Amino acid sequence: AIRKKLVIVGDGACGKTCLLIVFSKDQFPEVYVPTVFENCVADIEVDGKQVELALWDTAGQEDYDRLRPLSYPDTDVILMCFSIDSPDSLENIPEKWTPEVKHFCPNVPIILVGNKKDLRNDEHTRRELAKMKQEPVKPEEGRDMANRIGAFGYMECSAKTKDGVREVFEMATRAALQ
Ligand SMILES: Nc1nc2c(ncn2[C@@H]2O[C@H](COP(=O)(O)OP(=O)(O)NP(=O)(O)O)[C@@H](O)[C@H]2O)c(=O)[nH]1
Ligand SMILES: [Mg+2]
């Protein structure tokens, strides 16, 4: 089987760890871990080809800025995440994550991922965002950002409902196979 390394990055609490676990274990996590720490290699088939996907979780907090580059060597595809309930995490795509990622992984394909799609129409989410004069990220905002950073594609998903999750990792696999 083809062996590809995947690294997921994005702001603290935007759903990275839950996405890896929903995809690799088909279950939304109960217990809390900052990063998936036990082995995390998932299988996927794309156009007849069997692909082995090593999932490298990272921490989004600035506390971990010193150590996160230790995960970047030999990366084949990057999942760059924001949360649809957080326009701030989108604005950190060009201001924080693309600079860091493209510095250590200069030509590694990027899939831009908007997590927590199930909160786009969530009442508490919109009330929280409205009090800051904000609304959830619209799909055209994610597309525009993806074009702007040169991502191979833009995908939306919800780890909670699993909607879009498999597609995210299929798209990432296609990018890495290039
Ligand atoms: N509604 C909703 N909540 C989600 C979804 N994915 C994750 N969450 C929730 O969002 C919170 C953060 O998720 P988590 O995966 O820990 O985020 P992270 O990006 O890995 N955080 P960190 O960088 O600190 O490790 C948790 O409370 C989790 O249950 C989703 O698709 N929908
Ligand atoms: Mg995490």
Curated annotation (Swiss-Prot):
Changing residue 35 to A: Abolished monoglucosylation by C.difficile toxin TcdA. Abolished O-GlcNAcylation by C.novyi toxin TcdA. The modification (Microbial infection) O-AMP-tyrosine is found at residue 32. A motif (Effector region) lies at residues 32-40. It is a lipid-anchor. GO terms for biological process: actin cytoskeleton organization; alpha-beta T cell lineage commitment; androgen receptor signaling pathway; angiotensin-mediated vasoconstriction involved in regulation of systemic arterial blood pressure; aortic valve formation; apical junction assembly; apolipoprotein A-I-mediated signaling pathway; beta selection. Glycans are attached at residues 32, 35. (Microbial infection) Substrate for botulinum ADP-ribosyltransferase. (Microbial infection) Cleaved by yopT protease when the cell is infected by some Yersinia pathogens. This removes the lipid attachment, and leads to its displacement from plasma membrane and to subsequent cytoskeleton cleavage. Its EC number is 3.6.5.2. (Microbial infection) The basic-rich region is essential for yopT recognition and cleavage. This is Transforming protein RhoA.
